[PDB]
């Protein structure tokens, strides 16, 4: 079980320099006396790594508490520990570090390692209580107070200890690199005796691979496991802990860098060069030996001509009168601009059944022709306007062939077509000799022969007129209410388009390197005011016949010349 410690009080960060530490063997291939260029997650040279005391005594009284914060895990971590008394014991890696997400626990007792991937319920201050035996004192017994419970364990590993026994200035440096790539937790390690160096020593030591775990979890944060030799119940005035936290640990974060590594004759990495550190290192990498690129445009400009020829969709959707359901109002739309956003964004309509085309990319598609069908129907019959459907309207009125490309849009029309006394101007056939073909318009009024005798245009026994009228009233139920319906069938053919979407333009930035798009001509460069004169029918300019030096902006007719951004 876990034991609550005091608040960490958010000690301010402190930094130190990493003089070319953290180089690990990237591959498992022996190379001798060769210089190899590898692009991988390396700790950049001469970087700032943040260092924490294992035990910090900052209070005026002398309060002694672990500096054990939860730190991010950004594309790998370089973790070094300088210590002499084995007060760092392991780490815990995860995203939420609770029973909500899987966590990886690595701990080293005096005998072996314990590696678990489970559902740990980590406490706020996970730790190990260390006590010697009364007679031997050769080894330290540890009480784990790291997690409250563990579930759903999917991994287990035990091996020789990661951290050697440290049982008085014989400080030791232990360096680890943790990477989490492709479902693999890769640990590289190295141990080096240190002497009289408080911070990271100046030198070079390569980190040989230690282990590859196929844990395959998500890690975003990590923490450090520390051991109290002291007692949490009774904190001593001083010296109960280990010399006020002389030992400490430094954390740095890996980054994608290109390194030049020098394998010597015995196959060990003796030196490395960080290609992004100085211009010098850049030269060394370019020559693969130890002995206009400046301007990049930030914004984009699109300039297109005005959207003038606009659809008479208002003459269709805002029309006062919609034709009878057996005189379907089919209207041509062409040679003009189509803004479907106005209709879709308004969403004042009830339906947007768009088939073969998604309704949000209609503005991006300029079609050849548009057919706009306008009328009013009952709501319960609105479901019948789609291909492959049947019913009185779908079979007898207006057949939609199974291969539609287009949109059906219907909206409530109770306050527009309905009257108190019933609006019977909308006529509806219930009988026909046969079903239709798609988009057929039958406006015949011949009386249908329900019996065996001919009607000769006269109703009677088994003789009925085709059209019955509809009782549109403002008190009718939702199914019996009027519904204004328009079907837009869009033609996508190997023919030039006449109905296009609202080509949206932008603002203009001059005298700055920018991505530009003038009338479909796309490029990258800087724009200036030019004294060239274009003839009214001319749009671009090409003085050298292979690059467009000048252009005429579509909206404001000034002529801007294009200088290549690369100086």
């Amino acid at each position, epitope marked *: 079980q876990c034991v609550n410690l005091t608040t960490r009080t958010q000690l301010p960060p402190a930094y130190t320099n990493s003089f070319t530490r953290g180089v690990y063997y990237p591959d498992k291939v022996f190379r001798s006396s060769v210089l190899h260029s590898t692009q991988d997650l390396f700790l950049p040279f001469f970087s700032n790594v943040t260092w924490f005391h294992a035990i910090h005594v900052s209070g005026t009284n002398g309060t002694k508490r672990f500096d054990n914060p939860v730190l991010p895990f950004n594309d790998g971590v370089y973790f070094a520990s300088t210590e002499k008394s084995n007060i760092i014991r392991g780490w815990i890696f995860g995203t939420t570090l609770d029973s909500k997400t899987q966590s990886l626990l690595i701990v080293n007792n005096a005998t072996n390692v314990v590696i678990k991937v489970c559902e740990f319920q980590f406490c706020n201050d996970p730790f190990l209580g260390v006590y010697y035996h009364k007679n031997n004192k050769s080894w330290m017994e540890s009480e784990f107070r790291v997690y409250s419970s563990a579930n759903n364990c999917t991994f287990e590993y035990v091996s020789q200890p990661f951290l050697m026994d440290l049982e008085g200035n014989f400080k030791n440096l232990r360096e680890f690199v943790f990477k989490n790539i492709d479902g693999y937790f890769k640990i590289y390690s190295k141990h080096t005796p240190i002497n009289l160096v408080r911070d990271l020593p100046q030198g070079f030591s390569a980190l040989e691979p230690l282990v590859d775990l196929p844990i395959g979890i998500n890690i975003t944060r990590f923490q450090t496991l520390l051991a109290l030799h002291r007692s949490y119940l009774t904190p001593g005035d001083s010296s109960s802990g280990w010399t006020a936290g002389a030992a400490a640990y430094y954390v740095g974060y890996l980054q994608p860098r290109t390194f030049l590594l020098k394998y010597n004759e015995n196959g060990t990495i003796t030196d490395a060069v960080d290609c992004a550190l100085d211009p010098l290192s850049e030269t060394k990498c370019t020559l693969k030996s130890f002995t206009n690129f400046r301007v990049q445009p930030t914004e984009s400009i699109v300039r297109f001509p005005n959207i003038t020829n606009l659809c008479p969709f208002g003459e269709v959707f805002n029309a006062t*009168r919609f*034709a009878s359901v057996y005189a379907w109002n089919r209207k041509r739309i062409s040679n003009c601009v189509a803004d479907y956003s106005v209709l879709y964004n308004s969403a004042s309509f009830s339906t947007f059944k768009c088939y073969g085309v998604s309704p949000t990319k209609l503005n991006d598609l300029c079609f050849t022709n548009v057919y706009a069908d306008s009328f009013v129907i009952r709501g319960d019959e609105v479901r019948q306007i789609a291909p492959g459907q049947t019913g009185k309207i779908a079979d007898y009125n207006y057949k939609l062939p199974d291969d539609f490309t287009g949109c059906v849009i219907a909206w409530n029309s109770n306050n527009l077509d309905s009257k108190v006394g019933g609006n*019977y*101007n909308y006529l509806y056939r219930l009988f026909r000799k046969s079903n239709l073909k798609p988009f057929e318009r039958d406006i015949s*009024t011949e*009386i249908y022969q329900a019996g065996s005798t001919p009607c000769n*245009g*006269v*109703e009677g026994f088994n*003789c009925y007129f085709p059209l019955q009228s509809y009782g549109f009233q403002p008190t009718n139920g939702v199914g019996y209410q009027p519904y204004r319906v328009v079907v837009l069938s869009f033609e996508l053919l190997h023919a030039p388009a006449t109905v296009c979407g609202p080509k949206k333009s932008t603002n203009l930035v001059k005298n700055k390197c920018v991505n530009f798009n003038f009338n479909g001509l796309t490029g990258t460069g800087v724009l200036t005011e030019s004294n060239k004169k274009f003839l009214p029918f001319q749009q671009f300019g090409r003085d050298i016949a292979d690059t467009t030096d000048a252009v005429r902006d579509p909206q404001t007719l000034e002529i801007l010349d294009i200088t290549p951004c690369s100086f």
Partner: nanobody
Amino acid sequence: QVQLQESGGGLVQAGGSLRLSCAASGSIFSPNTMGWFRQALGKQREMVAVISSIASTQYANFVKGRFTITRDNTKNTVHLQMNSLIPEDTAVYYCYAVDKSQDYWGQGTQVTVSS
């Protein structure tokens, strides 16, 4: 604005005759179809009769052999001769222009027959 002008109704004693006229103006494209519809207070539009450009005439069984429709091609107008009138014909009548597109109705003609 397609307009249908209707006239010629009123009050007539049982057995009399009336002559309604209905003239179409506006678009009225050539393949048109003019019909007359009946309604009494409390009932639905009763389709009296129908004529197309084919010159065919279609009548309902209600007024068998009694009402007739005449055409004027020069003015493209329609005329109902309503003879042998009965109290059961007491109903307001309207014109229906089938045409090819958006159908147009009239304003109404009162026809009253009683004794």
